[PDB]
Amino acid sequence: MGSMERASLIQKAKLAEQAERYEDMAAFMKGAVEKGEELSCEERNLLSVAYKNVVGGQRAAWRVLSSIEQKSNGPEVREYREKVETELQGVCDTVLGLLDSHLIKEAGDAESRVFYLKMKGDYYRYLAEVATGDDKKRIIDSARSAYQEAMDISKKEMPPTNPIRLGLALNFSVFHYEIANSPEEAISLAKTTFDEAMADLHTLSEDSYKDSTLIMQLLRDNLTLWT
């Protein structure tokens, strides 16, 4: 997208979201990132929404095919699962490459740095979901390390009700439960995150209250499922 204006790429990313053309949206936002300028809060959200939808479709397809493959155990089901898996890994590698070149190193504010590091943890987590061989442990540790740095910054720099801090804790708790085989750590993190946010709600406006309580409900939904 080197020949398109940055502002036009952002505008078309918003149009693609309205049209539910998430592959286009991701390509537009990849082009915007590669312009080399830092991203605004709104622009970071567009980047995240685009790739979450693309990878979300790939993850759903991989789970369908992996389930069919396990029920069978010709080469077609394995071959097609491998093809979807390779495409998923390519998308994750593309996102991680954008974070590494050079979104994270130029992110100095807590809101931007925590956002990108949470993304890094998320896309290593998606890689871990399909990983088996020599690198699954290293991918898991890469996810954990990114989540952990984001946690450390968010505890120092953000109030307990900050939606980025809450969503980071939510996803790190899912990492603990689903990836790291640490359900007790998952439950403890979700509980402490919820309780500390509850105690900070009195400081918020009506609109901020709605934003934070929505994510706290997701933490509560998981705790209900895990206990």
């Binding site: 979201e17 959200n45 929404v49 998981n222 499922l225």
Partner: peptide, 9 residues
């Protein structure tokens, strides 16, 4: 277990 949906801006 639900992660952040994050599919709508």
């Amino acid at each position: 277990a639900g992660s952040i949906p994050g599919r709508r801006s």
